[PDB]
Design a protein around this ligand. Sequence first.
Ligand SMILES: Nc1nc2c(ncn2[C@@H]2O[C@H](COP(=O)(O)OP(=O)(O)NP(=O)(O)O)[C@@H](O)[C@H]2O)c(=O)[nH]1
Ligand SMILES: [Mg+2]
Lengths: 175, 40, 289
Amino acid sequence: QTIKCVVVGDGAVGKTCLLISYTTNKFPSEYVPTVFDNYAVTVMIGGEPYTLGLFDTAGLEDYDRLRPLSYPQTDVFLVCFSVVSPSSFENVKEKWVPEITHHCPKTPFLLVGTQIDLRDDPSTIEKLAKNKITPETAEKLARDLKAVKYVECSALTQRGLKNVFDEAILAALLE
Amino acid sequence: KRKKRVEISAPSNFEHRVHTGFDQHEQKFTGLPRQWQSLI
Amino acid sequence: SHEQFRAALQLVVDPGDPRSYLDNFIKIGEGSTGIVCIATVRSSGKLVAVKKMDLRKQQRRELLFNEVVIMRDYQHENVVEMYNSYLVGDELWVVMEFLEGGALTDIVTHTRMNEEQIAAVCLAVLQALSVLHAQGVIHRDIKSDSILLTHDGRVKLSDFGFCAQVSKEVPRRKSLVGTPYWMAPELISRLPYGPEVDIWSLGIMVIEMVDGEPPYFNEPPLKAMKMIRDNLPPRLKNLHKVSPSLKGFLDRLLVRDPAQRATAAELLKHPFLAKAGPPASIVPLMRQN
Ligand SMILES: Nc1nc2c(ncn2[C@@H]2O[C@H](COP(=O)(O)OP(=O)(O)NP(=O)(O)O)[C@@H](O)[C@H]2O)c(=O)[nH]1
Ligand SMILES: [Mg+2]
């Protein structure tokens, strides 16, 4: 039948690139703010076709007025934080989960760590070091929150990318 | 029936159904879902 | 990635093409990974089974390594003998002994087994599982379909495609593997799990042997999994037809907490298994008789 999956999180976190890398195996080189995009793909689940509807929402505060119009009939959420932005990780707890809990309290959600390949990149670690997240920290927040589970991935290298949507898809169909 | 597994395949059939944008000039949305247009 | 896998497999199989010594390839069944044929050895007339698995049609190609490695490195009375494997075109072919008694499934859908036969089957599977689990091999797909019988009623475990290895370095697996109605609740919850998942699945198979089918079978697979995940352990429906010995046995298998589920070695000493009839007692239940 049909699974609805909405992707929310702070701006610049990598929600669009996640979705475009999954659906088409391409990276968008530039950074354009999302207002709203809806995609769909077919996914085979034990030989039976499902439409995975993917609702790419604005992280930017400019388009708050619009975002929750995506939320009715949602089967699963991906609450995204970049693992190289502590501010976006704290906004999972402080903002995003409160939003989706209020509009969609019975709807399961997964915490998605994005941009995990920049955990090695020294360029960005310097600006984390001078200003002064790991799986074990996010997994606690997932168990507390209470997300279905924690998953993480990189849209560039596709590490654990398929697994994000695999667990999202299972989460939706169980509940 | 009893031999149905939970293999989740790779995606196929990409479909970009909606692209909403924002007019710089008129402070307006372009490419809304027509359902939402009444609301705001 | 297709070629790299094909070359990987090439180096692991036996060389050549078994069509060079086998005739009369006739389809016997289908599976998730592929089809099983019977074939004849040209020189002797001995029947063998041949499992054919297309490399392009697997969702996780790496699981095809198990189809070779397990029967190769875990030979045992209660495991299906594997003679050879080969790479023919884009297919993994595994030649193995033909088990003429068929699957346990055929029996439990068309007949009711008594407790002496149930104990005989359970005993054989646990003998196999205890040996596999001692080496950290988890089968991950125990059900009636994975248990095959000889002519004389001896029980062998098959379908190793979904196996995994645990060790001190990797004590748990995370993969969603198996067949919905037989899956352990911790596996469905997406927690790390161990060899205990096989014991749950065995418990579900004991429900097959007494009630004819697994719990929640009339429901769709995904809703059944939610039910297995959230509900208390399922019960035997035919309680009128069951001993306290069997009920006590099944209560050691169907424990939600993996830590308090019995191990295979622990279960080999259980009193219910003292009821086990020999090979012969399963022969009447076969479709022939
Ligand atoms: N190294 C790395 N960089 C990434 C990854 N994903 C995104 N980025 C970087 O971060 C930027 C964020 O892009 P985008 O996916 O549009 O983020 P967004 O969450 O949709 N922002 P908005 O909510 O305003 O639309 C990208 O342009 C890219 O340079 C990733 O997986 N790895
Ligand atoms: Mg964007």
